[PDB]
Symmetry: C4
């Protein structure tokens, strides 16, 4: 067992092929499957796993009542092999958590799980299944993190956390760890900007993150940092907005530096992702500009470096008649691919129940996962597929 370098360039890809679909909610109509949300994927040297935040309750059970709620003492980070339902008997316990990130350094799994009261939460860092360190809330206002994979390079693992208001200026920090111990941290200066739920991946030895602005931006913040935690922060340059809510493309003008918002888009957002491709960018977004429905990915020419509106490729993986949700980035290491570059992949959360489906008492999600390939790949619509309401709703 050796540490993964993970210092290779990110692969350039021309399409995204479906890798898995867990069908968790369909299965949970009868099987014993956790109510969850905030799923994500992370890969070790030999296996990829799906992580998720349970509600400490099962689908179609009375304890699934009121699971639209975000935080409780019953939520836990757990994982299953990629493609498995988040079920009661395969789930591996990772951390107590209502917010989390996880990744593998080549030797062991790192899991960071936040629990506790809103005004005094703390992250517990688990390494190889053992609690190694803690990070306390420094602003005492819902300490929270990525809800996707962290990044490990050369034995050091990195992640981003936020503490402070949901709809105004908050505080943003980058963390560095080795074998589960925090070894460095840096506060990111981003006045007028808002960073949450970063989707991060390694690219040529740096960590590149595409995040959620829940304040004044319908464009996505970009945060790039190195091993010293030196950073650049700004917004995805592209003249195509990729948060939700947002306005139609023709009503939007991009910015590399400033949050662009207004027009009824302020004070909300959704976790999402993008992948730099030289000067261009693959960016995901819901099909709807107002709701978490549909999902498509766009290749925007020069979209990483300028306010480009040129869409060279677009692929839809979920049509607008179906519910989506969070999306996030991860990479496949050289040990599984034998390539000289890191393969970019994304996952998609499909939320069922509240608030969009009010005749259900619960909220959960299922997922699809896609990986970049060297050729164009057709889209389709791989929807959650569950038939609501469920038994427990009647």
């Amino acid at each position: 067992p050796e540490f993964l370098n993970n210092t290779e360039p990110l692969c350039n890809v021309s399409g995204f092929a479906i890798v898995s679909k867990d069908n968790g909610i369909r299965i949970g109509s009868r099987g014993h499957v956790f109510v969850i949300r905030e799923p994500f994927v992370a890969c070790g040297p030999t296996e990829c796993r799906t992580f998720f935040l349970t509600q400490g309750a099962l689908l179609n059970d009375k304890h699934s009542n009121n699971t639209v709620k975000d935080r409780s003492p019953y939520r836990a980070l757990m994982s299953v092999p990629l493609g498995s339902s988040p079920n009661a008997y395969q789930a591996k316990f990772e951390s107590v958590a209502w917010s989390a990130t996880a990744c593998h350094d080549g030797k062991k799994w790192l899991a960071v799980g936040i629990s506790g009261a809103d005004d005094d939460a703390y992250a517990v860092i688990h390494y190889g299944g053992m609690p190694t360190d803690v990070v306390r809330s420094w602003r005492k206002q819902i300490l929270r993190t990525q809800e996707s994979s962290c990044v490990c390079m050369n034995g050091n693992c990195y992640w981003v956390m936020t503490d402070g208001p949901a709809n105004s200026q908050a505080s943003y920090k980058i963390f560095k760890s080795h074998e589960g111990m925090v070894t460095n941290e840096r506060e990111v200066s981003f006045q007028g900007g808002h960073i949450e739920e970063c989707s991060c991946y390694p690219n040529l030895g740096k960590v590149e993150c595409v995040c959620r602005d829940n304040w004044n931006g319908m464009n996505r913040p970009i945060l790039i940092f190195d091993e010293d935690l030196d950073y650049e922060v700004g917004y995805l340059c592209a003249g195509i907005p990729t948060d939700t809510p947002r306005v139609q493309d023709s009503s939007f003008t991009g910015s590399c530096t400033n949050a662009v918002g207004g027009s009824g888009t302020n004070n909300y957002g959704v976790k999402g992702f993008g992948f730099r491709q030289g000067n261009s960018v693959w960016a995901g977004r819901t099909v709807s500009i107002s709701s978490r429905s549909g999902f498509e990915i766009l290749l925007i020419e020069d979209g990483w470096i300028r306010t480009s509106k040129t869409i060279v490729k677009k692929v839809e993986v979920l049509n607008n008649k179906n519910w989506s949700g969070y999306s996030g980035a991860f990479t496949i290491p050289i040990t599984m691919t034998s390539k000289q570059c890191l393969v970019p992949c994304f996952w998609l959360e499909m939320i069922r129940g509240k608030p969009e489906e009010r005749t259900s008492i619960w909220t959960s999600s299922s997922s699809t996962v896609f990986c970049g390939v060297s050729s164009e790949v057709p889209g389709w619509s791989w929807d959650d597929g569950a038939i609501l309401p469920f038994d427990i709703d009647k």
Copy 2:
């Protein structure tokens, strides 16, 4: 870990002994078992596994409604150890798929799963659990493959795919891969012939396939190819027809070269198998000439090389009062047998529900598996055994 040679001759066998029976539908009356169809078996160096296409739903659940349907975004290729039910908690996710093939090269599992729209489907190739390559539909008409084990020899794995009409001339291709990457392909010229759902096995360093003609043939196509993808294509010579539907043996005249059909047998078929035995052949077939009921295997003297009607052995493993379905071939590698030849085995799918059992809202199947041995073995009737209708049907 080294690649399996798999270049040995196929064993000559005199009988087939039952190896496993999963009783999946009986168990799924109460247990949590996937609705499936198209099961198959493939063996690695140290383990054999049962693969299957789920419907992304469980038996006796409302989501099992309308599962007679062949393709959807919810179907997945999964696997369990040989003999296990295809259940919710042991199932290993392999690929998103409504058509599939899988095999083991000695080092890792290869799984090929087709999903997407009928007019723009694509296969995703998974190797060691990682997506490595894709194959796009080239005729834009239900790209489809074996629904049984592919063949690996000396580190290269091979499979057959079809694209085009179900009931007229289509296009047939052979694929070669190494570590999950397609390295060669060849289109098979077969004018007037139709190839689907090939059952393939290694024999003296070549791949021998017995397939389904869904057009004008009640005899089975035979496709034989080598590492260069050079091939011979034709029909099983035997003057005994082995597709379903077919006519009675006495109304049939064999052909090595031509599809023999008519008499109400055109435009359908069932996946099946055969094993060359020198110049002879073991071939499976349903007992009924018109429906998927019963199952028997026949040793036909010189049936691989001429229009022989001489049946030297016949063994029934399912009587005609019980539902059958697909059947397929696989082999056991030298690493498990210590023999100097590859052991021929077959599996049998037993379909319950629609269309034959109209009082059920669903369709699933269970399996039995048999392996060749050096002596004669008695038959019996190992039927699915489930008592229909089920709870969900009322």
Copy 3:
């Protein structure tokens, strides 16, 4: 991985301590647990496992109806780790079987499973999970075997089979195998005797078996054989009868050579066991002389070599107010104990449902397991504990 020698002497023990209890039927009131019977235990170098014959159906399901029946195409030999319930999700498939034996040679598991029609059954031998050989019925009358662990010594594994009438002279054979291939067999001459369901264990390089006479004997046959399959056959000498049904001890006179029966005890029996202890013997029996209720084990002074009635120790592990059933012998190898002798252990089957509990539609069993120790150990009553009837019975 090397073959277990297993040529050590059997340990002398002064008591039996409980090792496990699976509580399978209690658990199966709600959990997903197979209907079974004929459980047994066998140990490999590093693990002991519980084997069992399922009915291919789960407790509290409609398919459990009529499971008092002994043979069907749906029965399978499966296994779980020692102490686990025989449940739907941990069970490992071993063989299709309505009669079976299994053991471990130090390198791999050997499983022998009999299925097929009563008049043409056959055993399939599985080695390392691969079908290696077959044994056909030679009398065409319910080929059957031990329903307990076989014995492996120096890489060869041995077991006993019977074919012929249940209530008159039948045919008895000993088998020798290496890596799953039958390498020798010997028919046992036993005129006027009847041998079924042998409980066998290694002792100083020979196999010692205590069996069931289902014909004229309420005393148990003893069969001892060596690697050449040379044998001695007779009855347990002790003047204490240990089959069921039997008469009270004071009405019984022992014999080393002859079946002793009559008085309403002919034509039935129950699988049981004994362990030679020098010239003495530990022998199990039901507490009731007429029914399968209660269980006790007796140390009979010189009971292996003469018609002794001297009981030096007696321990009850199940009181006569509770249902018992089959019992069987196995040993723990030196690799788990670091001893210079083989530890004798036994398991006890506790049958619930038909025929004793007529208000239930089903029959299943659970187990307790006990191992010999160097000191006296108190008894108790570890009964099945399920509360009948079950939901499905109403």
Copy 4:
């Protein structure tokens, strides 16, 4: 595989961070989860596991009736990975047991399980899953042990047992074992004292235990011993009482030598724990002085060596509106932490059902687990979270 030294000093810690929460009862509302009580945690070189005593029955099943009862033939010690629910399909069988202790010596798991009649019980010692030795009741009055992790150092494992009256002078013994064999024992002279359910941990090569006095003490006995089983015995000096029931702190005067009781606190207690910190002590207790509700941990200055009332730190992990129960100590070995000291951790049992919740027919518990860290950590209330009554209660 080598034996763990475990001779390092115990770490000094300033706070306790939550490591896991199993949510077992919430999950068991629908999932298949054992009714349990007396959970505990023990760590091997590479994994921590949760152990528990089942009632041989599942939640929400009729067999859960009357599970307030402490002892039966159906109770078993089983384990799951840390954080998992004690469910029917992940549970590993360890021992038949209505009282137990378990630990890992670096090479194998040791499990000690007591079963049998109240007046003639015996412990079976399991090592590497094999029964190795027995300990008989020496006072014939409910032989019983820790219900938490034992301690292994340099290949020897130690635990404490009690036999005799629950509410008057009993007999207390320390045991030493190597590879599952008892190699030494010592009776502890403690006239007027009462020791049960010791929570023990290694500290600088000695075993330090904090126990339950069920007779005349609302203060906790302390037992410290070395490899020769030489011991010191007394009470936790602190002038803060930590048993339940107890009186308010201001009504209590500490003692290092004598049981301090009366005022309605005699003849009961609850399993609990403490950790020496130089001359100080971290000690757990229920928040309520009279009932098993709430849980807090206190750092008492010099509380190990004198009758101090100085509380320097206090952290609540369960508020007094929620049910608690047993608590216990364990340590994390150097192999998981790479530290030079042993990390102190504790678990908390949260009991639901009888006797406090009389509208339920059953009693079970779930757990939370916490580990010491080098900084202060906020508290919260991580309650069981199940909504009673359950289906089976109506």
